[PDB]
Amino acid sequence: SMSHHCEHLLERLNKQREAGFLCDCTIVIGEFQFKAHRNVLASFSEYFGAIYRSTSENNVFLDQSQVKADGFQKLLEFIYTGTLNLDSWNVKEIHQAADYLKVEEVVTKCKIKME
Amino acid sequence: SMSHHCEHLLERLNKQREAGFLCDCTIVIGEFQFKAHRNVLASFSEYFGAIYRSTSENNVFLDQSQVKADGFQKLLEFIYTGTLNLDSWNVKEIHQAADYLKVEEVVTKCKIKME
Known about the structure:
Two copies of one chain form a homodimer.
Chain A: H1 2-19, E1 25-29, E2 32-36, H2 38-44, H3 46-52, E3 60-61, H4 69-81, H5 91-100, H6 104-114
Parallel strand pairs in A: 1-3
Antiparallel strand pairs in A: 1-2
Helix pairs in contact in A: 2-3, 4-5, 5-6
PDB class: transcription
Keywords: transcription, alternative splicing, nucleus, zinc-finger, DNA-binding
Assembly: dimeric
């Protein structure tokens, strides 16, 4: 019932994101743009949460010298699915994205892996 | 991990709602107003979903002859917690709200109960 309720929610939220529906955040990293929901990002990222206490601008432009787009892609997918498939090649970038954006679930999963 | 992920999300989304944070929907039923998130409402209510394909107005004014505020309160709490505590006195109104707002999880739970 509760796994069913919140899993329903998460699937729908991810369907909306993939459809570009109600996405009130656009995250920019160089020539990459990502559509998402501010309430969802705030739920997992202290960086985005701190931002949305400070401005109503939808667009957040990230420092590309601090976050790789491919890292953020995997991080966003994790936020919207609960899935984090970490391997030797992507782990550093994903770690870097989650550390910069303060998504501590992932940071810890990464350094655990990095061993 | 996944129950943990989506339960985290849901708790945060409900904390945000109770704080009046990022709530881009105000639902009005007579002299009652409710703050919520449009993406969350759309995930569970075909009525609200159909609305957000049609307008960008945040406020939705409901027909109070079709939905009681106390019914909608319990329905909203369910949406944001996964919890639906139905008893003889509230079940009709909650049913009426979920039928009008097409939240089929609840409609069925109600008529199941109503036996």
